[PDB]
């Protein structure tokens, strides 16, 4: 039960669920791709992305931290902080 997580594993997870979005071209985004700056997304699309993060990793990100994550690396850093990865 509860297999351990790793930084490259969770990065692969967030990227893998990110290329399954019909509003995002998978051949353009990187780990420092801003949503409404480099990808031209919307705030509501960022909310849907955060809900996808919650439904992917099984824990809910609070709203006051959900309004701050703007790049995939920021989501990686937040999940790493909340799950205490790479002991």
């Amino acid at each position: 039960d509860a297999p351990p997580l790793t930084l490259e594993g969770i990065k692969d997870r967030v990227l893998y669920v990110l290329k399954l979005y019909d509003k995002i071209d998978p051949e353009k985004l990187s780990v420092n791709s801003h949503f409404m700056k480099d990808l031209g997304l919307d705030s509501l699309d960022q909310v849907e992305i955060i809900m996808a993060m919650e439904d992917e990793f099984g824990f809910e990100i609070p709203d006051i931290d959900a309004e701050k994550l703007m790049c995939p690396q920021e989501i990686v850093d937040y999940i790493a902080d909340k799950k205490d990865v790479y002991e």
């Binding site: 309004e67 701050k68 703007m70 920021e74 790479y86």
Partner: protein, 99 residues
């Protein structure tokens, strides 16, 4: 708008400090330095010895006192034989059979 760059610097420094702390939380292979220090005996010590002890207790300390162990008298039917005095109880009246 996400973080300010000031907050981003603070989060990065706290994250690398936290990762160093969690790396230091690991154990070296010598730790912990512990100092140096019969097949079915469960059926003997945990079963047979209590049977012996409390059978001695019941036979020689409980039943010697009056009315400690009272048992319901055995059921008596028409047709069996008594060990204590030997009477055969008479059989019952003939059934006016329904079948």
């Amino acid at each position: 708008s996400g973080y300010t760059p000031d907050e981003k610097l603070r989060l990065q420094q706290l994250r690398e400090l936290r990762r160093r702390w969690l790396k230091d939380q690991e154990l070296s292979p010598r730790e912990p330095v512990l100092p140096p220090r019969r097949h079915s005996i469960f059926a003997f010590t945990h079963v047979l010895i209590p049977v012996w002890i409390i059978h001695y207790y019941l036979k020689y300390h409980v039943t010697t006192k009056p009315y400690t162990i009272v048992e319901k008298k055995p059921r008596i039917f028409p047709g069996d034989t008594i060990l204590e005095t030997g009477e055969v109880i008479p059989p019952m009246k003939e059934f006016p059979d329904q079948h």
